[PDB]
Amino acid sequence: DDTSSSINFLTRVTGIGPSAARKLVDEGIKTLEDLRKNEDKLNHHQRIGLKYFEDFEKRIPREEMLQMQDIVLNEVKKLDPEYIATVCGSFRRGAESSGDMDVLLTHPNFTSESSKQPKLLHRVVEQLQKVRFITDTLSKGETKFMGVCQLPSENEYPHRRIDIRLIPKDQYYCGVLYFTGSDIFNKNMRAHALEKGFTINEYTIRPLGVTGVAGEPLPVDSEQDIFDYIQWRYREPKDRSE
Numbered sequence: 001d002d003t004s005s006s007i008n009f010l011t012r013v014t015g016i017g018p019s020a021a022r023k024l025v026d027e028g029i030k031t032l033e034d035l036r037k038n039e040d041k042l043n044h045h046q047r048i049g050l051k052y053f054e055d056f057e058k059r060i061p062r063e064e065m066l067q068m069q070d071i072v073l074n075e076v077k078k079l080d081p082e083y084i085a086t087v088c089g090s091f092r093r094g095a096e097s098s099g100d101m102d103v104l105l106t107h108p109n110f111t112s113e114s115s116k117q118p119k120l121l122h123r124v125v126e127q128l129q130k131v132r133f134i135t136d137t138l139s140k141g142e143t144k145f146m147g148v149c150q151l152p153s154e155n156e157y158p159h160r161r162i163d164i165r166l167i168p169k170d171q172y173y174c175g176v177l178y179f180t181g182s183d184i185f186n187k188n189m190r191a192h193a194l195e196k197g198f199t200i201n202e203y204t205i206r207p208l209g210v211t212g213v214a215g216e217p218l219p220v221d222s223e224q225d226i227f228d229y230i231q232w233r234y235r236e237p238k239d240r241s242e
Contacts, residue, residue: 003025003030006025006030006031007021007022007025009030009031009032010024010025010029010030010035012053013035013046013049013050013053014045014046014048014049014056014138014161015042015043015045015046015047015048015049015050015138016046016049020046024041027041029041032050032053035050036050044137044138044139045138045139048136048137048138048148049138051136052148052159054158055158055159055160056159056160056161058158059097059098059099060097060098060099060100060101060160061096061097061098062091062095062096062097062098064151064157064160065087065091065098065101067151068087068101068149068151068160068162069087069091069101071128071131071133071151072085072087072101072103072128072133073085075124075127075128075131075133076105076124076127078127079123079124079127080107082107082108082109083105083106083107083124084105084106084107084169084172085103085104085105085106086103086104086105086176087101087102087103087104088102088103088104088176088179088180088181089101089102089179089180089181090181090182092180092237093180093181093182093237093238093240093241094237094238099161100160100161100162100163101149101160101161101162101163102162102163102165102179103162103163103164103165104164104165104167104172104175104176104179105120105121105124105164105165105166105167106166106167106168106169106172107120107169108169110166110168110169111168111169111170112168112169112170112171112203113168114168115168116142117166118142118143120166121142121143121144121145121164121166122140124164125137125140125145125147125164128149132152133149133150133151133152134147134148134149134162135147135148135149135150135159136148136159142166143165143166143167144163144164144165144166145163145164145165146161146162146163147161147162147163148160148161148162149161149162170217170219170220171203171204171220172220173220173221173222173223173225173226174200174201174202174203174204174205174220174226175202175203176223177202177223177226178201178202179202180237180240181240182240182241182242184241184242185240185241185242188242189230189232192230192232193205193229193230194208196229196230196231198229198230199214199215200226203217204217204218204220205217205218205220205226205229206218
């Protein structure tokens with residue numbers, strides 16, 4: 001009812017999940033001013049999200065993402081030019097506007113065999129914080145950071161969502177592919193790969209075999225390699241709609 005209407009609203013809050021939204025309803029928490037008067041019952045994630053509820057509802061325009069992307073890439077280069085960083089999402093595909101920034105990062109020092117180098121990711125975050133670009137943290141793991149940023153005002157911009165994922169180097173390409181989308185695209189490409197005798201996922205590309213249940217990741221140094229494996233002309237991100 002006009003109350004379910006309530007769980008509907010809550011959930012619009014980053015951090016506020018259903019189960020999580022449900023309880024808040026059992027506490028008599030419904031509107032947003034409810035929430036604001038009730039910070040104490042929210043985790044840090046939900047707090048931030050509530051803090052920036054509005055801003056989060058706005059889309060990001062390419063002219064913006066561009067600048068965003070330059071800040072991010074230039075910082076990372078300064079720490080260590082060996083670092084690889086790519087901004088994915090529709091944006092990579094030439095989208096005109098976006099919902100958030102999604103950065104994928106890797107480093108030759110870190111491969112799927114290592115598996116433990118938080119510093120690699122932290123360092124960048126810190127750097128971003130120090131520059132005044134990242135402004136808050138929603139959560140921050142050993143492999144993934146979820147926060148908020150904002151373009152430097154010279155006078156102001158909304159706060160935007162940003163995520164930085166640390167992926168091993170030997171799995172990066174597949175990963176960039178993957179986060180590049182579109183969804184259909186992925187689907188069709190995985191479909192084709194299969195016809196060719198291969199299985200792809202966001203981490204690897206592996207040859208099939210008898211009965212099907214088969215594998216052993218092939219080496220990938222770039223997106224191009226994946227396409228070559230399945231022998232399809234290479235598709236630039238823009239031609240990736242489907």
